[model samples]
Target chain A: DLASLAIYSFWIFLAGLIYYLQTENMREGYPLENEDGTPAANQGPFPLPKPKTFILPHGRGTLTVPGPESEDRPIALARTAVSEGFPHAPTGDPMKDGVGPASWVARRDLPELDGHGHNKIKPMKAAAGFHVSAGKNPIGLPVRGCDLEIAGKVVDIWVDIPEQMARFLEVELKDGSTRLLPMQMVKVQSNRVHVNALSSDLFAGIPTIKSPTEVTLLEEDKICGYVAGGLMYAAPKRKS
Target chain B: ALLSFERKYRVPGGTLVGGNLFDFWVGPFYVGFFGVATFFFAALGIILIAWSAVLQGTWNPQLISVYPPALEYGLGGAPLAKGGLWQIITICATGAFVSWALREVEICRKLGIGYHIPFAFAFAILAHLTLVLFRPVMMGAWGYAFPYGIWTHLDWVSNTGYTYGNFHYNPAHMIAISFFFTNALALALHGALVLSAANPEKGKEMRTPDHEDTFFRDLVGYSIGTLGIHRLGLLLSLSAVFFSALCMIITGTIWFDQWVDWWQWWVKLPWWANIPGGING
Candidate 1:
């Protein structure tokens, strides 16, 4: 009985070896290599011949023709327009450029520069010669009758934490669109804001940043590019 | 307020990096590089979660969800209020998880113990990554990833499971489920055996490994021994999670047909018709 079991085990082993050889032989051209001893691009067992690109119609049916392969072409080479100083392009840093959560509380929630929780740009002054508060709150100011022809009202003001100055004026437009007007480009007054050297169409092209906390460097570039372009274009020609 | 044993074991020069720069402990916490990384990512992730909640304006636990951008956005980055917050939060969460595991490694090195703890935690991390990153990447869209929410992820799992025409029919998922059930059974048996040996009546002596082996041997004619049972338990648990990751990853990437249709081979087999009292018969 032990001899019979040994014979049976040997037969099973022999059968497995034959099956392995059969499968190995079936792989005729697998694991293809380049002429330089490096692995080839197409390494599958079956060769994937390039299909025809040219086509012809015969009796209401279309015939096809093959085209040259561009398999080794790089993605950048395939791009139609070459990027030249693209403003909003990422810096490739994960923390700085990659998407992530903004900080919990914005700088607007902190104490103002004057240490008094007032919405004024500067501290209240009481001069001995002129007794009046020189502070002006642009909270309810309208952004009407400007050279840009933009229609909006100042809803909020964003302040820089480290610099302690107003940076952006959050304006709600008449067409239900919201835009942030830079404080440097806006002259604040008691009645309305004087938008300087920028047209309404150019202002509309400014990228929309949803966060009330901070603007990323990429977003800052786009915003500055559009606004600076508007300013440069709107400058009057020299008077000879 | 350091205990005598705690002070005795607090030696220097076991760090993998930085060479005694951060080997010191402060108030029962090891402030290593990984510790700092863990804190930074964890704190930032929590703050972002809070900020997202505030932006969405709903503090309700069920309603509060950070969703990725719509399917139209594809794999590109979305705006901050959109899926970008979810993406960044995911990065932070992954960083925190990995840093925590590495900190465990540093602690283990300090004690000169085995690296089993970190190795075990890696399986859970693998499962989560399979759900969020691997499967979504293979499917060609970041929108394929699950949303970060209390009820949203559960809904996602349910919808995704049904999309394959009954996830229970999936062979890999079935194997993973079986492993999970077997792990529970093994843990129960091991716990009962150990407790039975340890808990002796008043004036009775506690039983040894001899008693444990002999008890199982007398009942079932075989015993895996105490250490063998622990090894078996570890293998089963790890394999359960590993297979779970595999089951989720292979859905759209490798197999795109309904799982119910995958059984056509068995139905079409010639032996099926020849079987006694079979449907064809």
Candidate 2:
């Protein structure tokens, strides 16, 4: 009886947990659509959880979950092949279109800051105690994208101090605008810094930081998302 | 470099099970019921590992391995050579990890600190359990669990997850990988943010949370505040481990197919899956 009682409790608790978790996650990214743009035969195994409102701090605003429904904005890109399960092809340079993998969302247009009201991510030159490692300085390295086309030379490295590492490589484009390429996207090779996503031409249109010294949260997301999206969309052939 | 008042914080009587019986300290470390149990299980497991290897005639440490039983053994017991040693060692290791967490809890009680540290650690234990216990049991064989070895465990991961294919294709694995990187970034950001103020500009007094809040607000348009940052970091870290466990749990137990093919679901989304003529093609 004792063993059975324990089993019953544990079993029921876990089952409830599973259902709760699944429904919670399904609160977003759910209500699947039919291939023909109609409502799905079944939304999911379980209905989405009721949206709960959360009060933003410092009287910012209120946010409701299952974010107010909006109809799909007809994503930018082309359908490849007549059959439905095939991935889509991009219109032109996929990286430039911000389609699928290259898509970005809106964030506040302010710079992230340190615990102490200073900008968290600032150029090595702007931030004190930040010097290029005495060993290999990537300052003047020419950066190339997937097409092996040279984008620009590395002008500086941006440092995110609390996390204590470089976040972006400041590239001085052939034009006047200096863009911030995420450090993860920029590989420092023996001679040149290589970027395997967007080609050199796409660098000019990339979102730039408002201030030359720092990258805000919004610009970081837009630029990084754009470069990252290029992984599968940079070339016409990748959609296949 | 030690605080004088901190020395007196260790007074005793925070034991959960033991009533001042095993609550005494052995030198610097407290020896609770769990602490003693931790030692017993660990020492015994180590002995078994040592003894198991002696049978194989090697104590090189790095190469020594006591792997799970063969598939034929299933959930039933088997000879010591046939993974029984591995089985018992797994049990011991789990027990020790749990005991360590309990010990941490008791210490927290004594210090009157939040249980956040131990709670986060439990997720780590859950991650291990999902692999060694839950996943194997669900798969109907302990053999699915990665072997316990220095380099062999790494070898097991590479072999078991991919068998030469990429593990990144698995959506859960991708989620786990993303969370891990995100957590690392948050940690770096938080640590740097805190240090920036705490270790202020030269000759300046220490700043308060108001400054940190404004810093966060100016950057992200909102601040989670001092407590919120820790809570967020903890949430991010636990999610990484939780998804990691789920990633391994789903593999071999459910969703048997190429991870790349899983993306077909998105391609079939009603919004565009059936569009007439390509949008840009």
Candidate 3:
């Protein structure tokens, strides 16, 4: 092609690249929803992308594109307006209802493994090789939630072996039940740990795993989803 | 011996800025006279927001927006429909943010801490001012600001984003974004190192920054030790924020050309650019 013709062709090529990328990403969440969780007419501008297999890191496994529908069940929400773009008011408890931001696919029940062929995440007590700093361990520190009430105390920490990092705090509630709280989600202050996502009452309902020392990918999903849901469902005021 | 211990002191009332001895924090749970200013402005702003929602009849957070006066209105005040409510609300919101900063200042004073927190917060406030006040004022219009709402602000960003012709193509923006990503990487690695040091093998005593440095040195051939990494992170973080504001402040206020085309300056350099069809061009 001539230089001018080549430039025009390049423009079309760039435009198609953009369209292609948009369609691929659209595989996760598409077919837009109307104001009330109803089907929308504006599904997508392009056809669905060809399925692509992605090899996961550390031999995690393979994932296929357009994996599955985002929602496994019906959404537990309602709408406020008769018109478009209205906010959805949750009719059911959004956290337990599983339509919150925290909700994602539960692809596997197996605990994620480290490179050394051991469970990637383990409670520090069970890990037997890890220790904390000079009497500065968070084991007994009180965890203050969004409502600034003490919901629990850190009983132990869960560490990721390959990451060489603390992943979650194993919290023992006042009611004597244990739950996992992500390390990054809260501010770890000297006197107390401040968690602004969930209130004290909400902390009581944290999803539990089958084993005290181990957490599977599905359980992690549920536990994290509950916290993620708390972002929006933490208070009634946020709905406004 | 090394200078291990540092000196400290309790700042007296002499350090007070519009405060007596009693003021400390913000709680309802917060407020200083600045907080009173914060509350006053915020209350007015909130009430106006609700009222605007009524006028729009949407009550929908996504749909309800109080917009600045049209560009035709210039910098002058306007009737409510013509920009009255939005103008007052803008003052209220700006005052609220400014007072909140001053409140942080007062708190920092009581605690005998440096004004780093307040000063850092002020940078964020500068971003708002440039968008609504600084840049708009220079442009001779009060209308450049986005409508105050969750949805429409982004809508304005997307639209305003176009006026500059692909903002991501901007060098300042690209650098700002890169710095931010770098900061994220910096934070992640630091946290990982700190966490790793805090929790060593159950039998092995907790490690020091020495161990952390060695891990990095072994992997990357060198490392910015604990203190050094924090210093680097701070610089990176500040640059990201500073340049983010720089791009916005300069857009339309000083530079009006498309972001991508700005490279003409480099390309126009006589040494390389003026060589007409040369490779360096």
Interface RMSD of each: 31.3, 25.4, 21.6
- Screening candidate 1 with a backbone cut-off below 3 angstroms (N, C-alpha, C), the clashing residue pairs are A52-A65, A52-A66, A53-A65, A53-A66, A54-A65
lDDT of each: 0.62, 0.73, 0.72
Q: Model 2 clash tally? A: 9
Deviation (Å) of B276 in candidate 3: 6.9
Q: After TM-score superposition, what is the CA distance of residue A40 in candidate 1 from its true location, in Å?
A: 68
The complex in candidate 1 yields a DockQ of 0.00
lDDT tens per residue, model 3, A1-240: 599999999999999999987886665554444433455565646867887655443456666666554444455555445643323455666677655354435458889775355797999988867878554568889998888788889999898765556889999988898999877677788999888778888887888889888999988877876776675467542322
Q: How does model 3 fare in lDDT?
A: 0.72
Which docking band does candidate 2 fall into?
incorrect
Task: Please give the TM-score that candidate 3 achieves against the real structure.
Answer: 0.50
Off by over 4 Å in 3: A1-240, B1-30, B274-281
Model 2 chain A weakest 10-residue run by lDDT: A231-240
The full ranking of all candidates by lDDT, starting with the best, is: 2, 3, 1
Instruction: For residues A79-155, write the lDDT of model 2, one tens digit per residue.
Output: 44464332345556544554445555456677766555577788888878878765568888998877777889998
**lDDT accuracy of residue B222 in candidate 1:** 86
Candidate 1 C-alpha lDDT tens digits along A148-208: 4646787767654322346667677777676676666677877778665455544454566
Q: How would the docking of model 1 be graded?
A: incorrect
